[PDB]
Amino acid sequence: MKHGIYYAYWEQEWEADYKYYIEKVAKLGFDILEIAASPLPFYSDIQINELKACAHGNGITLTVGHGPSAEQNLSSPDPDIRKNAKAFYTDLLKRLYKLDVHLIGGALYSYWPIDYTKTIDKKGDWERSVESVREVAKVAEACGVDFCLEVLNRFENYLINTAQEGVDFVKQVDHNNVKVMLDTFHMNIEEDSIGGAIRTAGSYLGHLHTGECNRKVPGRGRIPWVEIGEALADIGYNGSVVMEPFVRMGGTVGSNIKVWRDISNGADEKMLDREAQAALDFSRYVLE
Amino acid sequence: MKHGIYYAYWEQEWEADYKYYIEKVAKLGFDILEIAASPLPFYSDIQINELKACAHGNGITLTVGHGPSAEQNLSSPDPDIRKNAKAFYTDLLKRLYKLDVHLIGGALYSYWPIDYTKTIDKKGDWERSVESVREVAKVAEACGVDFCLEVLNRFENYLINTAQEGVDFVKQVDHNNVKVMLDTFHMNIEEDSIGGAIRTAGSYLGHLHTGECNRKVPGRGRIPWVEIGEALADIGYNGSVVMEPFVRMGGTVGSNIKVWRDISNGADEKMLDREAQAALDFSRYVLEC
Amino acid sequence: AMKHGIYYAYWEQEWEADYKYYIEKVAKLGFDILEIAASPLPFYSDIQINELKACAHGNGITLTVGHGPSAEQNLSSPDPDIRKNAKAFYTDLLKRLYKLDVHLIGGALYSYWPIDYTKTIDKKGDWERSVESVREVAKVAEACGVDFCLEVLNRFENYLINTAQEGVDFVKQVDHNNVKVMLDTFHMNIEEDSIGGAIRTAGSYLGHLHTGECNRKVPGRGRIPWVEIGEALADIGYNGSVVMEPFVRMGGTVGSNIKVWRDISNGADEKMLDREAQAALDFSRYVLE
Amino acid sequence: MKHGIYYAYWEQEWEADYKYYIEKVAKLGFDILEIAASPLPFYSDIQINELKACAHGNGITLTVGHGPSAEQNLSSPDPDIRKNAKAFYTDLLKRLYKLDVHLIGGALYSYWPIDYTKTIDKKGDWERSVESVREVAKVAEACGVDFCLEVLNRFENYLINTAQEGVDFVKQVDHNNVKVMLDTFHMNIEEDSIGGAIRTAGSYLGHLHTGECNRKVPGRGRIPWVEIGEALADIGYNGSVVMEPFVRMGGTVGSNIKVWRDISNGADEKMLDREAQAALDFSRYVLE
Ligand SMILES: [Mn+2]
Ligand SMILES: [Mn+2]
Ligand SMILES: [Mn+2]
Ligand SMILES: [Mn+2]
């Protein structure tokens, strides 16, 4: 299987010079660099082409993660918002095709972070989202991209909190390039069973994010990595595994991920590089 | 050890007929019933006396949990709010004295739930809180009440997220009746180690809340119960253990605890009672040495 | 729906006892099953066999049987006279079980136990002879309404079948109705890469399960992953029973055969043994579902 | 922390050309090679000096493991056996001094493997053993060697089966160079708690042997490695950690360790090297 890491582990904002990280992760030994979709729309066609060139030259495959804004909310009861959202994903997805990216993941059926202050209509948001996703799925399938729906803990979203809910949603969407995406941090909170949640996702599991219970890099925390590896083997998983560690305070990243203490224990860039590399060796060894 | 359960496991609002719950948990075998503070400021003297007599007659000890409102935020930069907050706690602690309750717990150094939309000033809030808590602690002590500060996960508060931070805050407060309160649900998210967090709390641990990772009753989930019992034995834990399971959608409870699916799997009241009793048996067997 | 039992040897230091005494004790503690040692059963008159069965019936207890074969009962032996004695022994034993109304026997029935590990080992040869011999005996077991369960043991106690995968390979090769795999948490704990995985491997072939902590204490306060076990039993849709086999006392043949060299019971008298067994029974019913 | 591996992981008899293993292990990155004591009495001083020089040239530290024969049983009720046994360790410890080995471990208070058919007099053997070990320890101190007493599961010995018993025995011996040695494979069977057993050994813990529940290399099994690293940190462990994996059938090793199936799943020497190396990276990452 292929292993990657989210560029945001080193950055405090939802964008960066991605070429810098492609080179970095290739040197550390990663197969994949995951990047935030946010800055992509603002790319000239030329920038898109070189980023793609940088990735090919360094033997790195690029995956994309996205936290939709409120106006990109496919579940919205406001038809103008669903309208804008579909337009947004259609454009983004064509860009991904030109960028040669074949996977996008996140709360793509809703938005993130969300305003939990508003009233919640789970039944109606669910129905609309299923319809909207099915439509965007035609475009994703046209652009050769898997549209991966991240199962999130209750504090970040109310629509899909367990692998079972994820599978139910995707089965309802009933379209080719829509997949369930599990994350060890979120599973850690909502699942009765980690290996059980993965077995439940089975063939709908299109992507996996990793991180310790409190988001440190994989390995020295309490996540049941051996159990996860066995469950991936049981479902014959052949997708990739991207670590999404967040250990630094500050910026929009620190605020959105809610890092209110220095979990990194003052690590500098070199120290962060070394821990990601050690987590990488650890992940290839235990998860495969 | 004494074992209890939060009445909210059966209810969707932050108040209820607590006498009904004292009778229920007594029959199920519990030593303690935790109740929400929310309605207590509106109890008349005889209602307080009746609640206290109900608990005594059923051999049940009452503990109190509270989620402070923004207007009760002891860490507020606004002096008027801190002033209102202290007046609120002073009245509440005196009611707790009348009720023969000796333990209050929750995010008492802050408020809950929190509007995470506002700008966060952790340093100033922390400093203000320590000072406010020091004086409320004095009232609590005079009332014979241990003032327990709950360590919460990052999604619910930003001041105190780990056992180490709670020890840091409580050592700064430096009042014997102010203690750290750990909760398996919250530790499950933030801690590098569960037994480790408990050993770090040590002599400062004044109360423990239990629940599975997704807040089901203790026992069939992934929380490391045996490791918790060993750690409690390592620190000589003298306090009590109260389960806080939340498995039902609806109402303010459902919305504040964010239960967005029927975790109880269609359980009626009798089914809820039976699972709590099995969790009680489990907790006594596994957590005690 | 799942039935739970306990091996009478938990209270005794020799491989036999007044089983009627244990049927009554165990019925009072709440178990569904009492597991008894086969050893004394051939010495029983027809009458005592009928009254043991009436006792079990009168107390609502189901009897299961465990057996450690002697070297002369070794169905895998390269000596044809031993295989012949072995088959005769099991044919007589199985008919007696049919009369006692027991429908399950388990142990290292494909070999013998304890075994003399000083002899040179011929695993391949013993393996082939055993499959053939078990297939034969299976015909009598089927005729007697008895499931012939082959216990998977750790490397220190046997060399033929040490993992759930080897047990399944053996049982599929025997290829006969009433022959099942029997797993034991104490044994799996040593040899398996995965406990849940071993159970899922055994699957439809799992005909019986023995429980005990890593060092053979009653289930619950040890390191065995009980929740994972319960999840795996549900995954396969297990319809059999679960018998705990704790051994915590030094002394006698049981003490040396089970190799208890320290007082694991920590001074427990009979009443304390009963209480711990009952607490483990409540734990097992709750967690294993 | 220094990490090693027992040469027997690649061999089926209790001897081998240790220079070959010193070179192999140094190349794989270990700090220590553990070797069996049994062929050492057959070495000339010239062989000892060249083994010592080879170890030194490759930057490898040597530790020794010994399974005493019934004739080397310091717990024997037979005074002659006790006398011979003491003579055997005196000579051995002198050889280790010559080899610059500072640690020997195993069932040094008894013998291994054990004849279990014999009558067992635990109380008697224990007292004789405490008396004998105390004497040998004066030689061990003179030779600069830590005499480490391995806590074993019940199937391998009856004298010391838990860390508490190990601590009791060493406290009663009351001598400077005697330590308790724990082993994850043995603890996995007898202990109520792994971290608890390590904290119980505390300052008496002089060495740690690692291996999964079924003796595979550390990492992909069920041993609670993070908990072990936590407990080693709690007691401020300054010793070394040597893995003792056994995944091969055949020979005296196969027979004594009771490997009755091919646990290596057809591994060739290079595959065994690779797995040892991944288990080494894992151990350094997770246990420190
Ligand atoms: Mn994620
Ligand atoms: Mn709580
Ligand atoms: Mn058994
Ligand atoms: Mn060892």
- State in Å: Cα B125 to ligand 4 middle: 54
- Chain B residues whose CB is inside 8 A of the A152 CB are none
Question: d(Cα B213, Cα B187) in Å, to the nearest integer?
Answer: 9
Closest CA to C255 of C15, C46, C70, C58: C15
Residues D177 and D146: beta-carbon distance below 8 Å: yes
- Decide: helix, strand or coil at residue C158: coil
CB B38 within 8 A of CB B14: yes
DSSP-derived letter for residue A39 is T
The pair of three-digit structure tokens given for residue A125, joined into one six-digit string = 């948001």
Calculate the alpha carbon distances from C254 to A142, C247, D119 in Å: 71, 8, 15
Structure tokens at B27: 């029959």
Residues in chain C: 289
For residue D109, give the nearest of D119, D122, D94 by alpha carbon.
D122
d(CA C138, CA C148): 7
Rounded to an integer, what distance in angstroms lies between the CA atom of residue C225 and that of residue B223?
A: 12
Strand partners, D4: D32, D242
Q: Give the position of tokens 């007898």.
A: D190
Asked if residues D38 and D66 have their Cβ atoms less than 8 Å apart, the reply is: yes
Determine if the peptide bond prior to D113 is cis (ω within 30°): yes
With the C-alpha atoms ordered C78, C84, C86, C90, is the resulting torsion angle positive or negative? positive
Distance B84 CA to ligand 2 centre (A): 25
- A71 catalytic? Reply is no
DSSP state for residue C20 in the 8-state scheme: H
Q: Is B134 exposed, middle or buried (0-12, 13-18, 19+ CB in 10 A)?
A: middle
User: Catalytic residue at D150?
Assistant: yes
Q: DSSP letters of A1-35?
A: --EEEEGGGS-SSS---HHHHHHHHHHHT-SEEEE
Specify burial of residue D265 (Cβ count, 10 A radius: 0-12, 13-18, 19+). exposed
Q: Is D66 assigned to a binding site?
A: no
User: Nearest Cα to C76, choosing from C65, C87, C89?
Assistant: C87
Contact D275, D211 (CB under 8 A): no
Nearest residue in chain C measured CA to CA from B219: C287
Residue in the structure block whose two tokens are 């915590």: C248
How many CB atoms sit inside 10 A of residue C86's CB? 25
Which of these is catalytic: A11, A34, A212, A244?
A244
- The residues near B137 (Cβ < 8 Å, ≥ 6 apart) are B147, B173, B175, B177, B178
3 state SS of D159: coil
Q: Return the SS3 of D36.
A: strand
> B235's torsion region: left (phi>0), alpha (psi -120 to 50) or beta?
alpha
Q: Is C36 left (phi over 0), alpha (psi -120 to 50) or beta?
A: beta
- Paired with C19 in beta bridges are none
Looking at the CA of A153, name the nearest ligand: 1
Asked if residue D67 lies in contact with residue D113, where contact means CB atoms within 8 angstroms, the answer is yes
Stated resolution in angstroms:
2.0
| Helix (H), strand (E) at residue C111 | none
Q: How far apart are CA C141 and CA A102, in angstroms?
A: 59
State the structure-solving technique: X-ray
| Bond before A113 cis per omega within 30 degrees | yes
Q: How many CA atoms lie within 13 A of D172 on its CB side?
A: 15
Q: What residues contact residue C261 under an 8 Å CB cut-off, 6+ apart?
A: C250, D120, D122, D154, D158, D159, D161
Q: A178 is written with which tokens?
A: 């829509």
- Is D105 near chain B, with CB under 8 Å? no
Alpha carbon of residue C142 to chain centroid: 18
Are D92 and D104 within 8 A, CB to CB? yes
Main-chain phi, psi angles of C34, to 5 degrees: -120, 130
> CB contact, 8 Å: B250 with chain A?
no
Structure tokens at D260: 């009755």
* D217 DSSP 8-state letter: P
Q: What is the DSSP string of B38-52?
A: TTGGG--HHHHHHHH
B80 is in an annotated binding site: no
| HSE value, Cβ hemisphere, 13 Å, CA-based, for B49 | 3
Structure tokens given for A77: 């009861």
Q: Look up residue B213 and give its amino acid.
A: C
Retrieve residue D70's tokens.
Answer: 């019934």
CATH number where B263 lies:
3.20.20.150
D21, D24, D29, D34: CA torsion to nearest 10? -10
- CA proximity to C261, closest of A222, A213, D169, B84: D169
The first and second tokens of residue C182, run together, are 């029997």
Asked if D245 and D9 touch (Cβ cutoff 8 Å), the reply is yes
How many Å apart are CA A59 and CA C117, to the nearest integer? Answer: 56
Please tell me the distance in Å from D20's CA to the nearest CA on chain C.
31
Q: Count helices and strands (H / E) in chain A.
A: 10, 8
Q: CA nearest A286: which of A211, A226, A209? A: A226
CA distance linking residue D15 with residue C288, whole number of Å: 47
Write out the H or E segment, with its range, that includes residue B208: strand B205-210
D209 is in an annotated binding site: yes
CB atoms within 10 A of CB B236: 9
Distance CA B210, CA B219 (A): 10
CA distance A211 to A217: 5
Report whether B22 contacts B258 (CB < 8 A). no
Neighbours of A90 (CB within 10 A): 17
Those residues whose C-beta lies under 8 Å from the C-beta of residue D54, and which sit 6 or more positions away, are D18, D19, D22, D23
Distance (Å, whole) CA C258 – CA C248: 9
What three-state secondary structure class fits A149? strand
C-alpha to C-alpha distance for D106 and A284, rounded to whole angstroms? 34
Question: Burial code of B88-107, b = ≥16 C-beta within 10 A, e = fewer?
Answer: bbbebbebbbbbbbbbbbbb
Q: Cα–chain-centroid distance for residue C23? A: 17
* SS3 assignment, position A131: helix
Rounded to whole angstroms, the Cα distance separating C139 from C177 reads 9
- Sequence-distant (6+) residues with CB within 8 A of A14 are A8, A36, A38, A39, A67, A252, A253
Neighbours of D72 (CB within 10 A): 22
D87 Cβ contact list (under 8 Å, min separation 6): none
C65 has which bridge partners? C36, C105
b/e A222-237 (16+ beta carbons within 10 angstroms → b): bbbbbbbbbbbeebeb
CB D68 within 8 A of CB D85: yes
Pick from C21, C16, C15, C90: which is nearest to C270 by CA?
A: C21
Q: How far apart are CA D275 and CA D277, in angstroms?
A: 5
Give the residue among C259, C202, C197 at the shortest CA–CA distance from C225: C197
- Structural domains counted in chain B: 1
Angstrom distances, CA of residue C59 to CA of A56, B227, C32, C34: 75, 38, 10, 11
Residues near B119 by Cβ (< 8 Å), separated by ≥ 6?
A: none
A71 burial via Cβ count (<10 Å: 0-12, 13-18, 19+): middle
Please give the residue of chain D at the shortest CA–CA distance from B196: D230
Rg of chain B over all Cα atoms, to the nearest angstrom: 18
Closest by alpha carbon to B269, among B2, B14, B21, B76?
B21
State whether residue A105 sits within 8 Å of chain D by CB: no
**What is the 3 state secondary structure string of D90-153?**
HHHHHHHHHHCCCEEEECCCCCCCCCCCCCCCHHHHHHHHHHHHHHHHHHHHHCCCEEEEECCC
Tokens of residue B98, six digits:
């009348």
d(CA A20, CA D234): 40
SS3 label, residue D70: helix
Does B56 contact chain C (CB < 8 Å)?
no
- In angstroms and rounded to an integer, the radius of gyration of the C-alpha atoms of chain D is 18
What is the CB-side half-sphere exposure of residue B267 using CA atoms within 13 A? 22
Task: Quote the domain boundaries for residue A94.
Answer: 1-288
φ/ψ (deg, to 5) at D78: -80, 105
Q: DSSP secondary-structure letter at C162?
A: -
Question: What does A181-230 look like in DSSP terms, one character per residue?
Answer: EEEHHHHHHH-S-HHHHHHHHGGGEEEEEE--TTSPPTTSSS--HHHHHH
Residue ranges of E strands in C52-175:
62-66, 104-107, 147-151
Residues of B in contact with C286 (CB under 8 A): 219-220, 278, 281-282
Kindly report the three-state secondary structure assignment for every residue of B119-177.
CCCHHHHHHHHHHHHHHHHHHHHHCCCEEEEECCCCCCCCCCCCHHHHHHHHHHHCCCC
**Ligand with smallest separation from the Cα of B246:** 2
B66 CA to centre of ligand 2 in angstroms: 10
**CA-based max dimension of chain D:** 49
CA neighbor of D242 nearest in space, from D206, D200, D203:
D206
Residue D244 three-state SS:
coil
**Under 8 Å between Cβ of B194 and B228:** yes
Opening angle at CA A227, ends C228 and B275, nearest 5? 30
Give SS3 for D31.
Answer: coil
B209 annotated ligand-binding residue:
yes
Burial C189-198 (b: 16+ CB within 10 A, else e): bbbbbbbbbb
Please choose, from the candidates C25, C278, C28, the residue with its C-alpha nearest in 3D space to the C-alpha of residue C36.
C25
- HSE, side-chain direction, 13 A CA sphere, residue A64: 26
Q: Identify the bridge partners of residue D62 per DSSP, sorted by sequence position.
A: D33
**Sign of the torsion angle spanned by Cα atoms D133, D134, D136, D141:** positive
Chain-chain contact of D261 with C163 (C-beta, under 8 angstroms): yes
DSSP-assigned letter for residue C244: E
Each as own residue / partner, the long-range contacts of residues C198-201 (CB below 8 Å, 24 or more positions apart, any chain) are C198/C163, C198/C164, C198/C165, C199/C164, C199/C229, C199/C232, C199/C233, C199/C235, C199/C236, C199/C238, C200/C232, C200/C235, C200/C236, C201/C164, C201/C165, C201/C168
Amino acid at C54: A
Neighbours of D44 (CB within 10 A): 8
B258, B265, B275: which to substitute to probe chain A, counting the most A Cβ within 10 Å? B258
Residue carrying structure tokens 């059938």:
D249
Calpha distance A30→A279 (Å, rounded):
11
Please check if A183 is assigned to a binding site: yes
Nearest ligand, measured from the Cα of B210:
2
* Dist CA C203 CA B138 (whole Å): 62
- The structure tokens 């709950």 sit at B150
Which letter does DSSP use for residue C11 in this model? S
- Token duo for residue D168: 């009791």
Nearest to D4 by CA among D243, D269, D206, D210: D243
Distance CA(C184)–CA(C152), nearest Å, equals: 7
- AA letter at A192: D
Our separate counts of H helices and E strands in chain D read 10, 8
Query: What is the Cα gyration radius of chain A?
Result: 18
3-state secondary structure (DSSP) of residue C102: coil
Cα–Cα distance for residue pair D181/D159, rounded to 1 Å: 14
- Distances from the Cα of A88 to the Cαs of A46, A52, A91, in angstroms? 20, 21, 5
